[PDB]
């Protein structure tokens, strides 16, 4: 019954900042691996960033090295996808996935970047 | 190239002191185990998370002080000498999985 809803979209050019929320529900289990996937129209799955089950160690793709960041807070069972200094080519609808039986992909919120 | 990437000094800087008072070396989100991690025989607890198509090298026998192995969502193959060394030296095993094959 765990559902992953996403928000935080908008319109902004390069040098912006947004935090996509990977909010989970059902019960507090926000201590697992959250694999982010990005889907620009006309392509297929591409991994963005994953967080260890410990939660203290993680890494992102080399294309977003030093800019992309992820964080989480178990108080309300959500994961924030921190963004800063985004390239104009990152305008896509993202997805966050946690592997508990299924690789659950959320609803997906589009982010518009000029 | 991953074995070439991680030098001994970088791994020793990656060392952690866990709550159980033992030398911890944590590797997360890697294609495989770098063979340089087996050069530091002072390792005590080894944590590996999301390591695909990983085969345990025979070089694991160098880790005399290895006691704890953590396998998080990782299915691993093992060599016969490595299997013997783990059968005769391993103390703790942390298995986190989501499927039988893991």
Swiss-Prot record, chain B:
Tissue: Ubiquitously expressed. High levels detected in the bone marrow; lower levels found in peripheral blood cells. Highly expressed in pancreatic beta cells.
Outcome of gene disruption: Increased prenatal and postnatal mortality, growth retardation, and multiple tissue abnormalities. B-cell development is slightly impaired, without affecting B-cell function. Mice however show a cell-autonomous early block in thymocyte development and impairs peripheral T-cell expansion and function. Conditional deletion in germ cells leads to abnormal sperm and male infertility: the cytoplasm of late spermatids appears swollen, preventing reduction of the cytoplasm during further development into spermatozoa.
Compartment annotation: Cell membrane; Lysosome membrane
Ranges for the LRR repeats: 6-17, 18-40, 42-63, 64-87, 88-102
Coiled coil (UniProt feature): none
Processing after translation: N-glycosylated.
Family: Belongs to the LRRC8 family.
Role: Essential component of the volume-regulated anion channel (VRAC, also named VSOAC channel), an anion channel required to maintain a constant cell volume in response to extracellular or intracellular osmotic changes. The VRAC channel conducts iodide better than chloride and can also conduct organic osmolytes like taurine. Mediates efflux of amino acids, such as aspartate and glutamate, in response to osmotic stress.
Related illness: Defects in Lrrc8a are the cause of ebouriffe (ebo), a spontaneous mutation that causes male sterility. Spermatozoa present in the epididymis display severe malformations, mostly of the tail. A drastic decrease of the spermatid population is observed, whereas spermatogonia and spermatocytes seem moderately affected. Defects are caused by decreased volume-regulated anion channel (VRAC) activity in germ cells. Oogenesis is not affected but embryos derived from ebo/ebo females show early developmental failure.
Domain comment in the entry: The volume-regulated anion channel (VRAC) channel forms a trimer of dimers, with symmetry mismatch between the pore-forming domain and the cytosolic LRR repeats, a topology similar to gap junction proteins. The di-leucine motif is required for lysosomal localization.
Subunit structure: Heterohexamer; oligomerizes with other LRRC8 proteins (LRRC8B, LRRC8C, LRRC8D and/or LRRC8E) to form a heterohexamer. Can form homohexamers in vitro, but these have lower conductance than heterohexamers. In vivo, the subunit composition may depend primarily on expression levels, and heterooligomeric channels containing various proportions of the different LRRC8 proteins may coexist. Interact with GRB2. Interacts with NOX4; this interaction prevents the ubiquitin-mediated degradation of LRRC8A.
Name of the protein: Volume-regulated anion channel subunit LRRC8A
Organism this protein belongs to: Mus musculus
Annotated gene: Lrrc8a
Range within the parent protein: 406 to 507 of 810
